[PDB]
Scaffold this active site. Structure first.
Site, mmCIF file in Angstrom:
data_model
loop_
_atom_site.group_PDB
_atom_site.id
_atom_site.type_symbol
_atom_site.label_atom_id
_atom_site.label_comp_id
_atom_site.label_asym_id
_atom_site.label_seq_id
_atom_site.Cartn_x
_atom_site.Cartn_y
_atom_site.Cartn_z
ATOM 1 N N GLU A 132 0.955 -1.287 -0.052
ATOM 2 C CA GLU A 132 -0.016 0.074 -0.082
ATOM 3 C C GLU A 132 0.756 1.214 -0.006
ATOM 4 O O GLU A 132 0.575 2.053 -0.524
ATOM 5 C CB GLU A 132 -0.927 -0.088 1.210
ATOM 6 C CG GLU A 132 -2.225 1.061 1.059
ATOM 7 C CD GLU A 132 -2.934 1.403 2.273
ATOM 8 O OE1 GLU A 132 -3.073 0.709 3.196
ATOM 9 O OE2 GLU A 132 -2.742 2.793 2.615
ATOM 10 N N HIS A 133 1.889 1.210 0.974
ATOM 11 C CA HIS A 133 2.751 2.348 0.957
ATOM 12 C C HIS A 133 3.781 2.406 -0.711
ATOM 13 O O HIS A 133 3.637 3.830 -0.786
ATOM 14 C CB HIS A 133 3.935 2.056 1.725
ATOM 15 C CG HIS A 133 3.616 2.391 3.279
ATOM 16 N ND1 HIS A 133 4.185 3.509 3.896
ATOM 17 C CD2 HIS A 133 2.600 2.129 4.149
ATOM 18 C CE1 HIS A 133 3.503 3.533 5.271
ATOM 19 N NE2 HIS A 133 2.525 2.703 5.069
ATOM 20 N N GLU A 176 5.162 5.026 11.733
ATOM 21 C CA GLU A 176 3.516 4.902 11.682
ATOM 22 C C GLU A 176 3.319 3.916 12.998
ATOM 23 O O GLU A 176 2.246 4.352 13.650
ATOM 24 C CB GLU A 176 2.845 4.461 10.377
ATOM 25 C CG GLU A 176 3.066 5.555 9.357
ATOM 26 C CD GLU A 176 2.538 5.370 7.996
ATOM 27 O OE1 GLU A 176 2.164 3.885 7.925
ATOM 28 O OE2 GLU A 176 2.008 6.135 7.017
#
Ligand code: HEM
Ligand code: HEM
Ligand SMILES: CCCCCCCCCCCCO[C@@H]1O[C@H](CO)[C@@H](O[C@H]2O[C@H](CO)[C@@H](O)[C@H](O)[C@H]2O)[C@H](O)[C@H]1O
Ligand SMILES: CC1=NC2=C(CCCC2)C(=O)C1c1ccc(Oc2ccc(OC(F)(F)F)cc2)cc1
Ligand SMILES: CC1=NC2=C(CCCC2)C(=O)C1c1ccc(Oc2ccc(OC(F)(F)F)cc2)cc1
Ligand SMILES: CCCCCC(=O)OC[C@H](COP(=O)([O-])OCCN)OC(=O)CCCCC
Lengths: 438, 99, 46, 413, 54, 49, 54, 54
Positions: free
Chosen positions: A59-60, A136
């Site tokens: 996703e990153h 994160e």
């Protein structure tokens, strides 16, 4: 022009499938803007222990370039046409979608296709996005809500892939090579496990042809059931100023019709926080009692759905002296609905739920997402008129019978975080799952 | 109208006026009255507080006020009525809604 | 009818930021708006 | 289906699109924002925003909550500096039940002494929550710095006034501001004729200074490792053509993100700042636009030590746009963003209602989306350079929050 | 809130009997208090019944 | 990270019925409660006698 | 005070042999006891209220 | 602070006996509670002493 009528003339959702098996789904209205995206049956549940958090790692990297548009070229093109590009990843669902001008739908569909299929995954870009995730993960440690829910799953579905967090352990983030990422992709990102959804000003026929043009190359791993365990995870940390508690019983999972009745019941109990206008006069007894006695700062009922299972319960955030009282009133509500729910309050719950899902589907993004995910979970979009029929079917008798199935005399999963000295002992919680009368 | 003769008689017989009390001071405090009292403005509340303090002090001594100081029947304002009426009217609405 | 994007507590320590990617979106671009409700949690906007 | 519009002889606007959806949103928009407080009744509009669902003449405090919840509905109150917006949602069959409640709330609230006093602590709860966002600190200070009076007012009640907003003040504020001449009644999924008739019969209520820009600075020293900071100059009034130029300039410079976790390759400010300093940061163009005035500038979020470098870098970027370094592909991209942004903002029936009502107060009638896009295109490259030039030479207003040891003053810049 | 913590009689029972915080690890030697109580009550009943005949 | 926390193995302690992590506990829930409550019910009948 | 005097009468009557006039007085006193508590004193309360506009 | 409000036994005595807030105006009819207590204690002592001989 009545409500019953209104439902009959809501725009239908179109359904087509490609040779490889990619489903194309569409809802149309004369709108200047649109939302289009790709939904995928892929997430943490599909990950093993050794490759956990790969789907998150991907996703990153998704928006960080393609073979056709290297580096910031993908980024630049989205920005310069006023488009908005976004992604998310649940335990079962990865999704990438783009909000664009209606006229720009061809390029929109093209770019999505380029992201999914031709994802760069550069060496330096991996090592960059490695440290990003690690930070994160640290930010996420400060979100007590996120932490307690991760804990709930971890204990609820212990010893399975559902116990796993979406982001993966730090160990995996620090070690996952590009070999792992590409292997994960080709295994899970397949046309029959994917849906192209779109909503806004568009002809369905056009979307399907654009799908052909760019998603034709898409290729063409069964989930084991997940064992729920009656368990407790108690991270005691007195240094934090408010306590987070999350409690749930095993829910039925996506397919099951009981979910509608459970939503009605969850609407009755509802949700609250300290900024709500209602206070004492609030309809939910849990909310009015919580408000008047300042038991909690906030609470919500949830019903989380997964494939063959789920989490049905509530989360609350409260003063360190209120945890026992919150539990007592909450569990008291569960019991009252099980044993003795009234017609008028179920009517209220029905009306809340009717209103909930009619107004949530406002504008193209939520509608696009409803198309995307419904096709994955149910195998179809369920029209609003059908939801209404399922809701009208629910009466007081139904709420009782349905709630008693899942709530009454059943072992819950408890997660607590913060100054949780008061948080009731599991035996006391478990005994709070029945009444000595009914 | 015609029973106003008896109302005036009963008033003096009852005799709370002899302690410098108004009728609404003598009301037995249930949950509604408590709320009504709670809603009184500073002036009306502090008067109530004093009138009672005075009456209790007189009761303590087993004495009454001078006759000039007694609450006149005509001057007995029904000070608690507007608050109490609405407190009750409100609760009856919640009790209705609950059915 | 629907619960908000975020549940609000007073006296609760706030969520951290440690990178660029989570910090973007935050720089205010338009004037404040304030909503309070019966059903939805209070929240302020840019 | 397209929108209908009426402005009654008493001043009041009715606008309604009957779209035959199952849900129906109704909004009563009132020129009663924080700006219409003076120094004597500060924070009154904040309490008033909290105060719907207190007892009205035709409905009790209890009935407003229970009756609305009974039909699964919602009642919201939304304040800007210039307007207050009372909004009701429900399933179409219960619109006139919610309407009855909305009318009661807005036209005849009782503001009972005991209820109003009981609500006082809610000002602290609501404020406390809102001020968890550091954007709220800075934007509220920014306005207080930038103005002498109307727009300088904060949306949140000042500490000293909490517990002290009187019933009289609430009555006065409603009586003086909630009037036909200042009201627009907007709606979806309801017929225009029945709205008009309600507005004639229940919203015919009889009637009841200009914002001086100042230029100042306010500095919240608080020891965060991040410094939030905003620097603006006087812009242009909403409704004027110049305002459109600033909106384009905002999108040239960079007005928030388009890609998730993206590096913002087209954002002029973000790249200007990212050239010099690589540690965690965010920068955006700030553009507020009001009836009397406007603020245009930028907002930085930077590390405490790097605040000087980030603000100066951002300010320098506007200077080169003002000097003339600006090509068509930039101005075209910026327009595409703004054009898309506007149509996307009216995409939801929530945001659409907000724009219909918003326009109806600040201007005469409804401007269709197609006409708005044409007006964005009408902004020439020269107009963008003028907006930037105006900002550079304009008297500045600034606000900051953080460990400000390396945050410069206005006169250090 | 519950009527175990509220009611003046139940309050004493709830605090000294039900929600009493007890160490996790107390052994069999801690049972003798309860047993002394049972003994005492046992003696009183049996005793009273004997006193009806003695 | 808190994502590093994963629940210890309780296999030693589990009932046979809930050992299989690929199967749902809900089949055995009817049974497991039955057993434990029977013990309680039997006890009460004995105490009653 | 009637109820008190009646109780004093019942005490006197209780001490007497079962004969005329103590049977009839006893009956009449017992009637008045329950009559005072269940009917007369409740009625008197409500009469007093309506005399005070209550 | 004093050892009337502190000591677990004295605390009950201090609150229910010494610092008890009592209405200013209670009459002779409020003495009968105390007198009932004295009666009960009187009966218990005299009674116990009689039971040593009966
Ligand atoms: C701590 C409590 C008590 C203890 C330790 C106790 C102990 C004893 C003992 C050792 C005896 C002689 C038993 C025998 O050899 O037969 C006895 C007899 C007796 N006790 Fe108790 N007693 C207690 C309480 C009571 C009470 C409360 C009563 C009456 C209310 C009572 C009434 C009697 C009577 C009547 C006898 C004579 C009958 C007999 O010999 O069993 N006792 N007690
Ligand atoms: C409420 C408390 C009590 C009351 C009302 C009460 C009442 C009476 C009465 C009316 C008599 C008959 C007196 C007579 O005509 O001679 C009596 C006798 C007796 N009572 Fe009590 N009594 C009480 C407590 C006690 C206690 C606690 C004991 C022993 C521990 C006790 C032991 C006796 C004895 C041994 C007799 C027989 C001796 C006698 O006739 O005086 N009483 N009681
Ligand atoms: C002529 C003028 C009369 C006025 C003066 C009254 C006194 C003169 C005596 C007349 C008779 C009085 O009446 C007297 O009442 C009592 C009580 O009811 C009677 O007692 C009898 O009646 C009652 C009736 O319920 C029975 O329960 C009871 O078993 C029985 O003994 C006497 O046997 C009777 O003699
Ligand atoms: C009151 C009690 N407190 C504590 C422990 C151990 C752990 C901590 C403190 C106990 O076991 C405990 C207790 C004591 C007695 C129990 O049964 C009773 C027996 C007799 C009785 O009557 C009386 F008053 F003692 F005479 C009252 C109760 C049951 C429990
Ligand atoms: C405990 C008491 N409370 C109150 C009043 C009147 C005013 C307010 C409340 C009292 O007179 C009062 C009291 C009650 C009893 C007194 O003497 C006792 C007599 C007997 C006694 O033993 C026992 F427990 F009653 F059996 C304990 C005390 C002395 C004072
Ligand atoms: C009415 C019956 C009274 C009674 O027995 O209650 C005490 C408990 C059972 O109640 P619970 O605390 O398990 O549940 C009460 C909450 N609903 O009994 C035990 O000691 C069980 C221990 C094994």
């Amino acid at each position: 022009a009545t409500y019953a009528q209104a439902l009959q003339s809501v725009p239908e959702t179109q359904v087509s499938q490609l040779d490889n098996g990619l489903r194309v789904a569409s809802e149309q209205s004369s709108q200047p803007t649109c939302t289009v995206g790709v939904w995928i049956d892929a997430g943490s549940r599909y990950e093993s222990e050794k490759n956990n958090g790969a789907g998150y790692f991907v996703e990153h990297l998704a928006f960080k370039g393609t073979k056709n548009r290297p580096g910031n070229a993908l980024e630049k093109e989205v920005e310069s046409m006023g488009a908005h590009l976004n992604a998310y990843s649940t335990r079962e669902h990865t999704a990438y979608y783009i909000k664009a001008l209606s006229k720009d739908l061809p390029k929109a569909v093209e770019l999505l296709a380029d992201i999914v299929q031709n994802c760069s995954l550069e060496d330096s870009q991996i090592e960059k996005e490695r440290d990003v995730i690690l930070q994160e993960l640290q930010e996420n440690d400060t979100s007590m809500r996120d932490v307690v829910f991760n804990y709930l799953h971890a204990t609820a579905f212990q010893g399975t892939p559902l116990a796993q967090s979406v982001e993966g352990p730090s160990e995996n983030v620090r070690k996952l090579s590009r070999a792992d990422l590409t292997e994960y992709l080709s295994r899970h990102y397949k046309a029959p496990r994917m849906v192209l959804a779109a909503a806004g000003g568009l002809e369905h026929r056009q979307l399907l042809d654009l799908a052909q043009k760019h998603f034709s190359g898409l290729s063409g791993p069964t989930l084991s059931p997940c064992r729920f365990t009656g368990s407790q995870i108690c991270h005691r940390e007195d240094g934090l100023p408010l306590a987070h508690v999350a409690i749930a019983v095993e829910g039925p999972g996506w397919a099951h019709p009981d979910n509608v009745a459970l939503q009605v019941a969850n609407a009755i109990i509802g949700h609250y926080d300290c900024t709500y206008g209602g206070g004492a006069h609030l309809s939910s007894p849990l909310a009015s009692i919580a408000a008047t006695n300042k038991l909690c700062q906030s609470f919500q009922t949830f019903n989380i759905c997964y494939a063959d299972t789920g989490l049905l319960g509530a989360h609350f955030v409260c003063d360190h002296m209120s945890i026992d009282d919150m539990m007592f009133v909450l569990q008291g509500q569960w019991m009252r609905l099980c044993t003795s729910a009234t017609e008028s309050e179920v009517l209220r719950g029905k009306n809340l739920l009717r209103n909930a899902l009619v107004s949530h589907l406002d504008g193209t993004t939520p509608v696009c997402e409803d198309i995307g995910r419904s096709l994955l979970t149910y195998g179809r979009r369920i029209p609003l008129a059908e939801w209404e029929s399922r809701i009208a079917e629910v009466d007081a008798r139904v709420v009782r019978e349905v709630c008693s199935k899942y709530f009454y005399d059943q072992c819950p999963a408890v997660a607590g975080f913060g100054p949780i000295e008061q948080l009731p002992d599991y035996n006391r919680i478990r005994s709070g799952m029945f009444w000595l009368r009914f | 109208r015609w029973l106003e003769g008896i109302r005036k008689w009963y008033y003096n017989a009852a005799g709370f006026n002899k302690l410098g009390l108004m009728r609404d001071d003598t009301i037995h405090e249930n949950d509604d009255v408590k709320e009504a009292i709670r809603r009184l403005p500073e002036n009306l509340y502090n008067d109530r507080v004093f009138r009672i303090k005075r009456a209790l002090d007189l009761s303590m001594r087993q004495q009454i006020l001078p006759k000039e100081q007694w609450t006149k029947y005509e001057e007995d304002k029904s000070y608690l009525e507007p608050y109490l009426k609405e407190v009750i009217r409100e609760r009856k609405e919640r009790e209705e809604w609950a059915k | 009818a629907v619960p908000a994007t975020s549940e609000s507590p007073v006296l609760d320590l706030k969520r951290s930021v440690l990178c660029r990617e989570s910090l973007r979106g935050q720089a205010a671009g338009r004037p404040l708006v304030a909503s309070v409700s019966l059903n939805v949690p209070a929240s302020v906007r840019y | 289906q397209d929108l209908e519009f009426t402005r009654l002889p008493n001043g009041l606007v009715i606008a309604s699109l009957e779209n035959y959806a199952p849900a129906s949103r109704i909004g009563l928009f009132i020129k009663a924002g924080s700006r219409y407080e003076n120094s004597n009744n500060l924070g009154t509009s904040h309490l008033l925003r909290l105060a719907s669902s207190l007892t009205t003449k035709g409905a009790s405090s209890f009935k407003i909550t229970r009756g609305i919840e009974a039909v699964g509905g919602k009642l919201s109150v939304t304040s800007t500096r210039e307007n207050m917006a009372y909004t009701v949602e429900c399933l179409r069959d219960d619109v006139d039940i919610l309407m009855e409640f909305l009318l009661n709330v807005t036209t005849a609230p009782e503001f009972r002494r005991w209820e109003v006093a009981a609500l006082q602590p809610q000002l602290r709860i609501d404020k406390a929550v809102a001020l968890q966002n550091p954007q709220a600190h800075v934007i509220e200070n920014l306005h207080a710095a930038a103005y002498r009076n109307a727009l300088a007012n904060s949306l949140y009640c000042p500490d000293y006034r909490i517990g002290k907003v009187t019933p009289v003040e609430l009555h006065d504020y409603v009586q003086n501001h909630f009037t036909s001449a200042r009201m627009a009644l907007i709606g979806l999924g309801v017929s225009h004729p029945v709205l008009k008739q309600v507005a004639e019969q229940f919203l015919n209520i009889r009637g009841g200074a200009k914002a001086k820009y100042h230029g100042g600075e306010i500095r919240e020293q608080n020891g965060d490792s991040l410094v939030h900071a905003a620097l603006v100059a006087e812009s242009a009034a909403i409704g004027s053509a110049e305002a459109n130029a600033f909106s384009v300039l905002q999108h040239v410079l960079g007005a928030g993100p388009h890609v998730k976790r993206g590096s913002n390759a087209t954002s002029s400010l973000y790249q200007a700042v990212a050239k010099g300093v690589h540690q965690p940061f965010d920068v955006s163009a700030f553009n507020a636009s009001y009836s009397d005035s406007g603020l245009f500038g930028f907002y930085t979020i930077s590390q405490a030590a790097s605040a000087g470098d980030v603000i100066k870098a951002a300010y320098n970027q506007v200077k080169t746009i003002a000097q003339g370094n600006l090509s068509n592909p930039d101005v075209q991209a910026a327009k595409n963003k703004l054009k898309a942004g506007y149509l996307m903002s009216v995409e939801s029936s929530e945001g659409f209602l907000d724009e219909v009502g918003s326009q109806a107060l600040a201007a005469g009638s409804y401007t269709p989306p197609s006409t708005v896009l044409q007006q964005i295109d009408a902004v020439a490259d020269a107009d963008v350079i003028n907006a930037a030039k105006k900002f550079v030479s304009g008297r500045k207003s600034m606000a900051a929050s953080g460990n400000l040891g390396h945050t410069p003053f206005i006169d250090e810049l | 809130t519950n009527i175990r913590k509220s009611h003046p009689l139940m309050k004493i029972v709830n605090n000294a009997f039900i929600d009493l915080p007890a160490p996790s690890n107390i052994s069999s030697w801690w049972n003798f208090g309860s047993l002394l109580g049972i003994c005492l009550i046992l003696q009183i009943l049996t005793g009273l019944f004997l006193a009806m005949h003695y | 990270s808190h994502t590093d926390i994963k629940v210890p193995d309780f296999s030693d302690y589990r009932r046979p019925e809930v050992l299989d992590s690929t199967k749902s506990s809900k089949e055995s829930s009817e049974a497991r409660k039955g057993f434990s409550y029977l013990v309680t019910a039997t006890t009460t009948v004995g105490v009653a006698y | 005070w009637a109820l008190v005097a009646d109780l004093l009468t019942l005490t006197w009557i209780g001490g007497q042999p079962v004969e005329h006039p103590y049977i009839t007085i006893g009956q009449l006193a017992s009637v008045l006891y329950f009559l005072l508590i269940l009917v007369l004193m409740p009625t008197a309360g409500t009469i007093e209220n309506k005399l005070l506009k209550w």
